[PDB]
Amino acid sequence: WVQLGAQKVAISEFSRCLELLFRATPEEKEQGAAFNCEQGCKSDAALQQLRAAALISRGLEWVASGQDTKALQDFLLSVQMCPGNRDTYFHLLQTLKRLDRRDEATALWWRLEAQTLWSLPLYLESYLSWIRPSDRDAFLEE
Amino acid sequence: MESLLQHLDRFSELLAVSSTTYVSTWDPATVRRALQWARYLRHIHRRFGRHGPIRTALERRLHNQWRQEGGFGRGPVPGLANFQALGHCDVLLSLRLLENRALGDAARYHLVQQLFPGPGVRDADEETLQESLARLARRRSAVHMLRFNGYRENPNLQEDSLMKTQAELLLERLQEVGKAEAERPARFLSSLWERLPQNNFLKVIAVALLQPPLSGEGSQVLVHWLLGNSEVFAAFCRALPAGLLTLVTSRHPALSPVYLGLLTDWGQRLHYDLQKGIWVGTESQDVPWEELHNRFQSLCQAPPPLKDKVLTALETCKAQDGDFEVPGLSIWTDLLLALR
Ligand SMILES: [Zn+2]
Incomplete structure (x- = not known):
């Protein structure tokens, strides 16, 4: 819907994804009731990367609408969730460079250099490679 | 009509000073005078207390008193709060004198002897002060007892x-x-x-x-x-x-x-x-x-x-x-x- 240009229904769907992600657990191996995905639809790495993906894809629509405070909330939450993706940090720091540059940006720079793929599904890998901007490292050394 | 103003305001001043700790000069004479005035007011309230210019005049006097005092600064003195309290002014006075520790001994004796003479006067036409205080004690007891046994x-x-x-x-x-x-x-x-x-x-x-x-x-x-x-x-x-x-x-x-x-x-x-x-x-x-x-x-x-x-x-x-x-x-x- 984003590529078709529909902010409202896009944000609707991202929010629905987020509700299902936080108000439910995929790793409910209490009752073995069927055939199930052993590895792809269980991985906590897949869960966190996917949380982060949906937060970012929502924040960019808030940016499009002019609600940078909500966008900041989503990007901050994605950084709290997956601190080792760096797309989170790029988006967050672009927003902070727009609004309140100096102190917060450097505070997160130091977090990045304190921090510095395992087995993801391909639908997630390809979703991230699609949304990520080419000017990431150029902006992150600025 | 005008005769009652100087009666009522004087009684109100006497009442307001009743609760105050200046009681040295008091005597049986002052107490007798107090309680006969209070009987007079209680008699007025019975005789021509309803449906006339006198009732509204007394209400004007009372409420004007309670707003010229206001309740700020020099004294938050109650006073007799309303025209219905005219019918039991004597009881207020008596209670305030019984609470005043500073009351003199002979005044205290004369007072209590005039409130509670005993059963020598068991037969009375008007509901007297002794009966009024007894009924008050019963009510206070009743209120305590209901509050702590049955009330929710x-x-x-x-x-x-x-x-x-x-x-x-x-x-x-x-x-x-x-x-x-x-x-x-x-x-x-x-x-x-x-x-x-x-x-x-x-x-x-x-x-x-x-x-x-x-x-x-x-x-x-x-x-x-x-x-x-x-x-x-x-x-x-x-x-x-x-x-x-x-x-x-x-x-x-x-x-x-x-x-x-x-x-x-x-x-x-x-x-x-x-x-x-x-x-x-x-x-x-x-x-x-x-x-x-x-x-x-x-x-x-x-x-x-x-x-x-x-x-x-x-x-x-x-x-x-x-x-x-x-x-x-x-x-x-x-x-x-x-x-x-
Ligand atoms: Zn699967």
């Missing part, structure tokens, strides 16, 4: 028995100020607001807004006072329970558009966190989700004249913040979802 703080405050009593006193006390017309009721109420405990006072206002009339000019005054004073109404709607405010608002439509406006502003300063599926506030004094849900649920479980009002006020505030139909985006969508 009813949750529907409007049907409680303490709040209902306080309320009727307030309403009578506003009626007299209205008839006086010297100072406006709002000034009395504003002074009360500074003076006495707020939490108690607000429950009492809430209750007085619902008692039916007995002479509803009383409630009509408090609505004006509240709509004039926003700060009190901020704590009014905040402190009380839900159904009381609901019944108040349904009784008085003038309180409805402001009350929803108060609630509409408390939602807007919440924020949703995704990890715990709960709206929360930034500051600690921001109304929680549960309390706000309770208020809107009570308002929806009400007569139809208010249901449509609150429902339209919620829909117009939903559409104002994006007409979403999914949770995590609008407190108002989340309310309307939780009501169903």
Whole structure:
């Protein structure tokens, strides 16, 4: 819907994804009731990367609408969730460079250099490679 | 007519000094004079206390006394509070002298001997002072005994028995100020607001807004006072329970558009966190989700004249913040979802 240009229904769907992600657990191996995905639809790495993906894809629509405070909330939450993706940090720091540059940006720079793929599904890998901007490292050394 | 003014004001001065610790010069003569004057007032109240210019003259004198004193600074002296207290002025005087430790011995003896002579005077035509004090002791005992053996703080405050009593006193006390017309009721109420405990006072206002009339000019005054004073109404709607405010608002439509406006502003300063599926506030004094849900649920479980009002006020505030139909985006969508 984003590529078709529909902010409202896009944000609707991202929010629905987020509700299902936080108000439910995929790793409910209490009752073995069927055939199930052993590895792809269980991985906590897949869960966190996917949380982060949906937060970012929502924040960019808030940016499009002019609600940078909500966008900041989503990007901050994605950084709290997956601190080792760096797309989170790029988006967050672009927003902070727009609004309140100096102190917060450097505070997160130091977090990045304190921090510095395992087995993801391909639908997630390809979703991230699609949304990520080419000017990431150029902006992150600025 | 004019003869009673100098009687009544002199007696009131004597009464007011009764409670005060200057008692050295007193004697049996002073006490006898006091109690015969009090008998005279109690006789007036019986003879021509109803339906004449004299009653209204005495009321003017009493209420003018209680407002020229006001209740600020030099002494918050009660005084005899109203024309009905004319019929038991003697009892007040006697009680105040029995509480004054500074009373002299011979005065004390003469007093108590005149109050409680014994059963030598078992046969009397007029209900005497001894019987009056006995009946008072019985009532005080009865009140203690019911309060601690059978009484329960009813949750529907409007049907409680303490709040209902306080309320009727307030309403009578506003009626007299209205008839006086010297100072406006709002000034009395504003002074009360500074003076006495707020939490108690607000429950009492809430209750007085619902008692039916007995002479509803009383409630009509408090609505004006509240709509004039926003700060009190901020704590009014905040402190009380839900159904009381609901019944108040349904009784008085003038309180409805402001009350929803108060609630509409408390939602807007919440924020949703995704990890715990709960709206929360930034500051600690921001109304929680549960309390706000309770208020809107009570308002929806009400007569139809208010249901449509609150429902339209919620829909117009939903559409104002994006007409979403999914949770995590609008407190108002989340309310309307939780009501169903
Ligand atoms: Zn799978």
